[PDB]
Point group: T
Chain length 160, copies 12
């Protein structure tokens, strides 16, 4: 037998900094989600359908992404905060307009916010990775996914 004795083995808990870094990624993921739906509903113009559908896909990814980070925070004993007031006050994403926007302006607007969201993740990467690699892999999924969304969307307005 190589069995341990301990009857109260605890789990890995994150430092205050780690939790704060994930909280930063959470509010931006939620803000991207909210802006994503906004764009999804108010976009109009050439190739409306394509963008209308792609935006919902980006939202699906953002929502499952935010849930993953939030639950990951819970796992490491951190407490996430995704309430509306908190998101609006702490998000680093540029405010999205409130009215109808042409497909061309939606492509640029959202592409910018996806990138803003990816910059947050790339900014906290090295710190969350140094403390917990396993969490860094989740961020890699977010980065790859979001950046792929950016590509799919931005390509609509490309030169040649």
């Amino acid at each position: 037998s190589a069995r341990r004795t301990e009857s109260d083995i605890q789990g890995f808990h994150a430092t205050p900094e780690f939790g704060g870094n994930l909280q930063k990624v959470l509010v931006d993921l939620i803000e991207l989600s909210l802006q994503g739906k906004q764009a999804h509903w108010n976009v109009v113009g050439s190739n409306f359908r394509d963008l209308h559908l792609q935006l919902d896909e980006l939202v699906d990814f953002a929502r499952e992404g935010s849930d993953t980070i939030a639950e990951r925070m819970r796992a490491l004993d951190a407490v996430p905060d995704g309430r509306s007031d908190t998101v609006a006050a702490t998000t680093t994403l540029p405010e999205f307009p409130a009215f109808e926007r042409s497909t061309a302006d939606v492509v640029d607007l959202i592409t910018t916010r996806i990138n803003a969201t990816v910059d947050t993740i790339r900014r906290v990467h090295d710190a969350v990775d140094a403390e917990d690699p396993s969490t860094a892999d989740l961020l890699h999924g977010l980065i790859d996914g979001l950046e792929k969304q950016a590509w799919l969307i931005r390509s609509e307005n490309r030169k040649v």
Copy 2:
């Protein structure tokens, strides 16, 4: 071509500035509910945590589908929705969801209360909506039935009999 209309441009039903405002109120409260639902979903702890952790997600799925439905019903009727965080926070009627871990019992009351508030908004607005466009009044009936069932499924956890 006997009964055929010769019109070349027949526009559809446009919603009034009042009707749109009434769906906007519904929209924002459905979104607040969804945000508070996820928050509760994440931070709830204590006795029968799993049952509530799972029920809260179903609540959110319904609220999310509800908000998409209403918002698109606005677009259909030529209205323009606003589901941005700043707006939701500044215009929602739902009392703020507390922060941190809350026990299962508290989460049952907090969420039950906020679901009723949301249904409240829909009920208050119903008559004005129905009298203008019955079709949208049906979308509201679906949201009322779905939400109350949700509140029942949740509040029952704390019933003492």
Copy 3:
């Protein structure tokens, strides 16, 4: 927190003693129908037995979903349903389904008649329900549409033209 309500306990819509009674009548007749549907499903014999053996099950599936919907709509509105056998038998309005094997033709008339009776109950009660809670009136519309289609799909078997 500008538009946010400060209430800590906002209760939901409660159904009246009359409203609940009106859904209870619907509940019991949907259950009788389901029990008579299975009975017919089992004991029907004769020409085109399969078609009716199968249609009767679809009828039962719809009645069962209907009864669950109404009963839960009562719970949602703070009412308490009674779908026990003793109660159903003693309070249903549907004429008793005969015993033993009944031919396809007879089963078509017997079941058609009992489906209409069930819809009857729903129609009689509709106005009182609608005037109090339109949302539930929609649940009834679904049951009326579904049930009449059912009766049509069944009664057509015996039409002579």
Copy 4:
């Protein structure tokens, strides 16, 4: 057998000669729309052809389900529908769909206009239908919501902002 009805033959709700006529108008326009939808689906060409080629099929699927629903709602209520080509052409209110290849832009206007006309018929008829049978008024609400969403999803392609 206390509450049980002794009736041996209880007939169901029969629709009036007016009600049936009002659903027939809806039926034929839903069919014209479906035929024009396929025609557009086939002959549309130009910028963003795929998006519209696909959206048009969803439009047709909805119109087809709509027409089947209404026609069967007539059968249920003892009415007899007529969805034959001669009748549809001779009694539809939708302006004729042009022939040959039409660009994406034109197809967006042509189809948007014809969807509104179809919804028109449903709206004009709604009050008469509702006052007689609310249950069928709900089927119409579904068709109105579905169709307007359809028109929005389509017309947005040509919006300039």
Copy 5:
């Protein structure tokens, strides 16, 4: 060729007793179903959701169980009777209450009725088996299934 001659080969038909034994199992299966839905709708209290869902599963099993016995009776030339009046008058299950019941009382109430339903099946087992083994296997499915439901539900109120 080893082919039979007979142009009117009949099937196995049950004796009056056999049919009566299956009829006994049928009315109790239907009564359990009705009581199951009743509990499913009116239960309240701690762990409401778990019980609310488990009860629907027990009903699903009871309904498909009653249909199996009824159709099996039809196969052997017996005529089942599952009408409301018959069920209420012939069922051996203890009446279930009509109002809201705490989860703790629902666990005990229903556990008792499932057992009552299983006792009926165990009571007619040896007789239906002696006459037709194939039918006994259907009863074994009912017994195993129902008793498994009893276990899943009753465990909620266990000591330690």
Copy 6:
């Protein structure tokens, strides 16, 4: 390298005759569809359910059949016309009645129209095949399918 030089390789385009032959098959497929739904809704009498369901299957086949021919016409540069007025004026199918019809009369009525629809396809077969075999295979699917529908339906009224 065996690579071609041409930067503007065109596709196979049909002659006016070919397109006209497919147009003939299209309007009859659509008319069968419309008549199919009509029968589906207004049929009554013995074995109503069986016919009610079979007719919807025949319609499903006719609709996907009409879409195939129409899109095939588009592929070869032809322009289909399936508008109501055109169908009613060019179809060769005998008008279907407007009221309730007994199942026995629906079987005969529709069987006749399916055959009428198959005769059109068999009539243009050799010409479309001589010009484009690949299109003839689509017609073979229609023929096999439709004729199978005819069999399934007509069998209801058979002698012995």
Copy 7:
């Protein structure tokens, strides 16, 4: 400790007689399958559709049964024979008529075949159960399945 120390541990071997009894079951299941498809093809007349469909369901159950019985023989190292000649020379089922048959006749003809098939299983039951009870459970499923099928089909001609 409780581990057995031999290296080749054999399983349960079926006696040649046991294999023979299963062979009698297999052969009738296969014959019934073949006859069912024949009826499925040539059935004709009133309520054609229902029968045409029920017969296919009967064949599916029969085909599944024969594969189950054949493999059960293999499991116990017996060797099945499902070849056309053996089936025609040893099946106990009455030959099936050769042309189009009305729905009324088909119902009567098939019910008899099913009963004859169920009969062989019942005749062989006890000898099988005495050697291997587990195999008897399979026979039980066939009996319940087949007899149910007999009920669904024979009912078309029941007059009460």
Copy 8:
């Protein structure tokens, strides 16, 4: 204006006694193939047993689907199929499958030549069928390259280097 035929009773395509006899030829070998395929499926034993056991069942499904298509194609064209065990044994052209357990290598060889035998039948009947009804030939094409693909998947087990 009007291209509609008058005619009350339009006739379907009827196969000639010769045509029917050719399909009966294909049908009978397909069924035999299926019987022999299950036989092999059960008694195959040896190196790479599983792959063979599984592939044989996939062969039987195809032959079964094929025989049903052929038998019904005869029916649609007013011909009468005969798939009874006696007929199949007395008229099939396939060499009969051996009686007991067979090694994987022998099963591959055996089944491979019985498939070749089956498609050979279809090829022998191809031209006569095609001439009278090309639509039936397409079905033949399907069986042919569907069965030859199977022959390849099974026979390749024994091919060397």
Copy 9:
């Protein structure tokens, strides 16, 4: 009129210490079989590796589903199962599986005799179980012919001619 029992607390069927001990015997060998099956699944190497790799997993699924059914059947009958690794190793009757890579031929032989060992256990316990509770025996029947079918599918790889 009334056949209802009065009794507040009707009791469930309780297995005897002997019965429970027999199922614990079946449980323990099933689990061991599963462990050994995954071992073989991972380390099998050689001619026809894939077929073996795959079939072994299908064997493990069955043994896992089987052990869960047996363990829960004990629970339902008030018995307490023990599937801990220590217990399984100290009480299983199956000869242990060798330590490293094993050729396909040896895996077939090895696993085949361990399955035979497992069902042998079930057969040894069959009669005693059947006598006390035939419903539990049916489950035994299922494991028996389910495991023997597996033994056939795997062992046949090594059988010659």
Copy 10:
């Protein structure tokens, strides 16, 4: 009686020429597949999404076609060659540009590739049909499938 008495009955063997004609088809199908993915990746500009998706559908049909043609050759004992070098050295399709290309250009470039691919099949049709009509049916599916794909894509640039 009707049973054939030889033991090795061979199937239909493809002539070396037949194999060569199919080889010409395979190679262009594979080239088209490779080019389609290249366009799928680098396509860029207005209505990016639709094209990006349609191109994948085109590749799926192409990949399925090449596997069908390659295996049809195997079935008839011919031996396919789908290796990169052979495909590049014998494909008849024009080379595909190397960088990002606009949606307008991609539509034109792909339509040409598809037509060239359909062309080879049409050129080889008769020689194939003369030897094995069944294989010609496969070619027909490719032609209908590919030409349909050409229609869906070329329409993006149609101006009327």
Copy 11:
């Protein structure tokens, strides 16, 4: 040109040490699986159902993990040992109690087992990552998966 000219190109081989570290992971994953089912069976008391279900989910993730780790060892030519004796003699997890345990105790007991299981993976992480980073990604999934499972279960007893 860029093609490599040797014929047997070997892949990455795992060192005996690397294999040993994965072996430590496998053994605890398997032990946890076995303990999870044991709890799944004997858990009893308040909120029985939720736990009973969550424990099964925990076992599924564990079983999938052990098969992933065992095969990852094979991929790199290491040889796993998941036999009962080896698992009992080398697992580092505390033994699991032998009888019925309350839901409260089970939650505490399992959380500890999961943490101990996650612990071994974390202890072995760096040594594994240094040799094969790709394998470290698998370890990361286990850590995120297992720790999430620990969170979902431990929360039942959290008091705040």
Copy 12:
């Protein structure tokens, strides 16, 4: 209060010419692997043909999914992939697959070393990629252990004892 960035045009992550060149290296070998995998899939012949035929297709799916992920990952990062047949043939590092039919044993050896060759490429590029973008390395990790698992499933067919 406000953490929102102002900036109208926030930029995305751009790969370096070096990084892009490394992924182009992985892409080109993945595609070649796929081409060679289908080749083997079609021409493999001999003992245990089926298992190989099937596993090879499963290898091709993975390599195809892999090349698409790599090519798009380049696109997302502003790099331009080249998967044309000419490029692949001129730059792939995999030894080319032989021309005709190949025995199962030789296919196992052949494909096994070409997979090793492919992952070797990915491993050679791993560190440089990881340093510039770890998120792209995770994708590499996926291809690596996904391809090595395949190498194991195929190569094990030839391993002895």
